[PDB]
């Protein structure tokens, strides 16, 4: 009935401990929390066609007695069956696609979640701690943007990086049910979604494989919405999941499938690249090859307002045979390096289109 | 004619890189509801065109955080970091000149300088697009831009991560109350938040209704008719948020999956279309700070005496080198 | 406004308690109702 | 779900044994109307007897010259679009395809005196646009060729006049259906030229172009395919035809003698004939054979022919 | 397209009907009866294969086994004889690209003052040195 | 066949008491820059009508309506919104719209659509995503011509130097227009003066040389006395500006001068009210329902 | 002369003489020649 | 989809002359005010066109033929009529027509209606109930503008006091009607001619009143006056077509007073 | 019998998968391919 | 001469002889076939 | 080819031979060089000894067209 | 270009090449007949 639900919610209820203290302080008290979350609704879509001269055959009109048309009808039926099987599998593929899509748009960067997590004491930091935190994050984000090309050669840092990344995220829930486990009864803790290159680079000498096949459930969930909940959904507009139990409160099978299981830090996790099984041979980009934007600034034409600062390292560096040194003139350009690694130049007359406008 | 007209500029260009991220997730992070499939058919080219659909739903089952991503590798850069100066004449500005025969002179001269300039006969559907070139070589061109500033603003400010306005601003600095977020950016009687010895480093670009602010702020909307992108936007237009008084640490929930600010398939950097679902990562516009690349005024200070080195040699005789402190220290040829 | 019609479904469907007796044109009195 | 139309005509200006199914066919009015129409529509200081000569010398060497008029019963009714294209192949910008079209249609028809018939038709069109009797007022869109029956010097055409193209079952060689196709010299897509380039709905127009400069007349037609509606389409081409508009507007007490008029300032007229309600219009330029010669064509897909044949004029 | 801020480094060879175009482009056949081979041919002359309107990347289909271009047994580099079949590999003929070898305008600028070492010292007083970037940066016998 | 349907996907973040408003906006017209089978909510909001940075105005909204595909909303299911195109050439079995005008609609009228010019907006604002949708007023053709005449007249007068009521069925309506973007207004004036221009040929002299004769044929019949009301150009010309006698009709044996003149005026006349306003897209046809249509009601309409 | 002659401009630099906007570039086709736009059919000094 | 079968109950007391003359008038066109499956005869008769309590002229009829609903008189049983809606969307299978105009419909031309602008009005007087019925001409659209321009201009010379062939399908047609019908059409065209001249006159003058270099007095109350008068008069003339002569295996040419099939645009 | 062949031919036909997505994206349909190759004739030689 | 197609109907002889072990975007390699 | 088989759907010993099999990556491939068994002692070049052509370029006679560039 | 001589002093700088070189192509077709295998049932994939 998911097409009817106007909105569905979930609820949490968590209590924090407390520490007896002596003065001079405020005497602490037990604290209670109460959160309530909503759900988002998303849909999938797929389509296929049956052109004319294929509809005029399945719908058995314009029939003819010969066999040369029964053959063509067989042909069109085969085309229809093939298209149907493909469009039915497209949902199984798009499910994993959309799952990756949801996961990526939610996960904040690591270069922030890792340092912030170390500063949790006094959950609301004051002003000065916040300033120091900002000052640290500014260096952190620039110092480890591309940590796997800057240390591609030193794996003992990459291993610690992975052990740190898979730790700073608190576990989600504990819902009693059969879980994705190893062959020897270890509860897998999470997944590590990569690309093919990075995976092949991680299996080399940075991580340790543990298994080749796991045991995963092969059944979906289940909700029915029948009983007193139906009445409460028809007269009024709300229904609770386990109503037949809320009443009394008041007054599973595995399958051996191949995969790669790795120990990072102290948690047995998965390691999957989904560029080959799915996303291959279709007009669909891989969602893990993302973009990034960086802003560059360069002062152009500045002249050092002093006498001391306009100096040389030694006497007679870059000296000109000519009489007057052409270097003590106010510079009027700037040089830098292109993407391909060629020396370009940015003169002043490139600002003509911006300073000579009527505005 | 090479005469320095007693004014300096600050360049700001925005490049883009295709990187290889990495994602982690905890067991049972999403409660995933799948509905029931429905089929609705419409007409086709003579035939029938079926369509299958199915509703779904999800929710974050975690109390704290559950998943985390990170940029890991670097594929090819996407936009050549060259010198493609902008042009203001793309914009149907306000107060025009007085003699139409000097406006044409200005436009003719400035179009004699660059290759990004509008076509002469104003078309009727769309607006004043640039000339379509025959071939594109190194990738999409980045639109370098200029903001005026005095000639003597010292260099020690341009050797590390800083702000093109000359006055570090934004929300991250203080969010105790509401009206403070405005004074921090524009009130020039209070000392600058980062360099507390001065009000600003640049009067002509950091004051309310100043030159640069009237030139760039998205409120005043000067370059509204031009399709060209402008990097100084997120550095000049004041950010505003609905929860400016509610959330205490939104640093995370503001810097995860921001949508693109431009296009990516045009031979130049154009403003974003209405229907692009591209999604990127922005560490720069988050702290409102830019990074200086390897630049110099004398092209001979970038060369050393033997076998492929970089000639730091900070300054020499009124000409400067700025050894880069970018995120991209290595991972770039030269 | 009139959120009051939002506390329940309009044609709830439960068995009625009784039945009216006057079949006059109710449209003319559409101000004494909520 | 479709609609067919039938017409028996002679086969001098058209041979369905040679056009392939899906080619657009055009219908003509009686030539006798041009006489009186030019008689009171010609400009002062200009004699319409040059139009008389054009038509008379045309119909003197096309077919049986007699009984082309009133009391016979039969007439030269339909003409192929490729025909009217290839007798004016000296004005289409993509020269090579139009030239291939012309030589192919000069060799594929009867073989004798068509060079004659072609320049006759070209001269006739030149004369009519010169005497201010425009061709768009006499030539209409009939349909897309579906099936035919021919005899000695007479044909029987059945064509699609309404509805989807690919819903018309025909008994030809390969497959029971057929798609529309036009010569590659008349194709003129406006989206590139106005830089809209968006997917979705596209109309198909039938546009004429007039260049009336003294003793230098010019008549050519294209088959437009744009996103614009019938309202602003006139604005669009009026825009990218600025020079022609200028040429015609120039070289076409007190009084009003010697002023700009409508007959003198006209340059183009167009009509809506169909629709392409698909997701993206795909069309293929593949070189194809007319019997023994090879000429490039445009192969459209999913065109729903429209109607209400009203001509929208453009003198402004 | 290479250096967008200019139109062409050399106007005397690039433009149509110019000097270099006249002297080296093969469409004019001026250097036709000359037996001597001409490297600038592949650069000046506009290539043409009928796959223009038919490929996305025929790079692979046009960068595999191009036949030889010069003679193989003559003291000099004569044009390839018609009865030849030797095939080679032409990388630079695909990208229309050349390679600068280690060269200079002053012979004394190459050598370093001690023990068989090569010096770069790119420029010195109106006389220059070009440190190479060819594929064969090593694997070639220097003096020492 | 079947009508060209349009489904637009409502984003999830919409409160109940905003879809409540949305479930009341059926029968109202929306317009799409492009006619695809799928579209997004941000493709019909006012933010898609922005001329350049700024929200447009009447002299530009009119332009927008006549260069955009219209469509009519039929039913609003949860999480979607179906609609049928109008003027593309597809049939509609049963079509119904909602009167959004302030005036009452007769039967058999043609319908043009006009932006909100009476200064009263019933637009719905979706604050969640931060959008707003404005709906075009459905107006009878005669009122369309009157209002567009007033608007262009105010356009020409507004930009001369020194920088609004309408009666219909016995009621006065106070329109008010915003003439921003001085340039967009001049586009209309070019069309105004131009269509004014091509309406003159050599025949206009004779139709001018009899104006005093109409002053006497009007002094005896009632209706002609009305067309020469005490305030009109032709009246004042009949007493101040005289006409030279007609010089002989040159080439007048085969060519008739008056005929082409009056035939040429029929062309521009049919075009004037179409190019300055909009074309009539709908034609009210109440089969059995009540004859007149009040503001807010709903009736059946066929495509014309 | 209504406009500025073309052969006179020498204040340029090599980075400007190359730019696609110089209307003199199309006539720099030979190191030893000077192409220019000249009147037709006046061979000798001819009449004033 | 089903057609819209209108029926007009012919009363009794109709003389055999009128029944015998009605039984032929099938395939002609009638117009109602509203559309109902069950209508009467008065709603068809000329009495429905009384505009100012009097029979109308050509201009009022032109206006009415746009705000009404056309229909086609199919088979006529001795008791009643049978008509089908034509404008609204209907799949009517038979839908033939009879050409009432002195010009020949060619197979493939579109048809638009026109009041009896020239000559007399061919009608059938049912003197038993005291009412007559007029029928609109059906003409190809190619001539719609030409015939109007030709009838109105001729009425100007007859308006000019104080000191024309329509050839279609290669067949001439005059207008003087072998007699002197200069009078009779003056009563029923006069309103049209006035509204045209007072529009084209103020068009040449308002322009010469804007800038004098073409070659007390509110000019903006003048502009608004001209544009509205001109725009609301023009759109009446510029009809659209509603039928199309589609012929199969019959005679491609249709003569006046003959039958033929059509389709709905 | 190879010396009797005028020309041979082999035929391919592959069908590619697809991925169901969500708006705004054009609804995807499968694709089908149909390729055709030919054989080239060669020989060998040997003398004594 | 492009006459290879039609030597045999392009879909024909349903029973295959092999199995293409690669699902790739063949549209990119159009210029390899005839 | 398979005519009798398409009609129905329209309605051995090996040998242990010495080689040099190497396992490159996650694949198993042969590794051969025919120059000694096939091409040795005949008048035919081993076709895996192929040539390559590279184009070199140098400026001859340029002058630094500025005042800063010469130092 | 010559990644077999210039990088001769670093062997593991080449196994990365060849491990990828034999991967950038597509296996062609499985024809129904016994093929070349090794002495332990495993299948060969090509020649180098």
PDB file of C-alpha atoms in Angstrom, chain K residues 28-51:
ATOM      1  CA  UNK K  28      46.603 -18.058 -17.827  1.00  0.00           C
ATOM      2  CA  UNK K  29      48.341 -17.557 -21.167  1.00  0.00           C
ATOM      3  CA  UNK K  30      50.951 -19.136 -23.393  1.00  0.00           C
ATOM      4  CA  UNK K  31      54.380 -17.596 -23.928  1.00  0.00           C
ATOM      5  CA  UNK K  32      56.057 -18.251 -27.250  1.00  0.00           C
ATOM      6  CA  UNK K  33      58.808 -16.942 -29.497  1.00  0.00           C
ATOM      7  CA  UNK K  34      58.785 -18.445 -32.966  1.00  0.00           C
ATOM      8  CA  UNK K  35      62.170 -17.131 -34.078  1.00  0.00           C
ATOM      9  CA  UNK K  36      63.984 -20.363 -33.256  1.00  0.00           C
ATOM     10  CA  UNK K  37      61.596 -23.125 -34.278  1.00  0.00           C
ATOM     11  CA  UNK K  38      59.984 -21.475 -37.305  1.00  0.00           C
ATOM     12  CA  UNK K  39      62.043 -18.549 -38.551  1.00  0.00           C
ATOM     13  CA  UNK K  40      65.566 -19.725 -37.735  1.00  0.00           C
ATOM     14  CA  UNK K  41      67.910 -20.574 -40.624  1.00  0.00           C
ATOM     15  CA  UNK K  42      65.633 -19.214 -43.357  1.00  0.00           C
ATOM     16  CA  UNK K  43      65.720 -16.019 -45.393  1.00  0.00           C
ATOM     17  CA  UNK K  44      62.746 -14.428 -43.624  1.00  0.00           C
ATOM     18  CA  UNK K  45      62.868 -11.741 -40.958  1.00  0.00           C
ATOM     19  CA  UNK K  46      61.117 -12.362 -37.660  1.00  0.00           C
ATOM     20  CA  UNK K  47      58.126 -10.009 -38.049  1.00  0.00           C
ATOM     21  CA  UNK K  48      58.225  -8.934 -34.392  1.00  0.00           C
ATOM     22  CA  UNK K  49      61.322  -6.812 -34.997  1.00  0.00           C
ATOM     23  CA  UNK K  50      59.481  -3.718 -36.179  1.00  0.00           C
ATOM     24  CA  UNK K  51      60.492  -0.137 -36.796  1.00  0.00           C
TER      25      UNK K  51
END
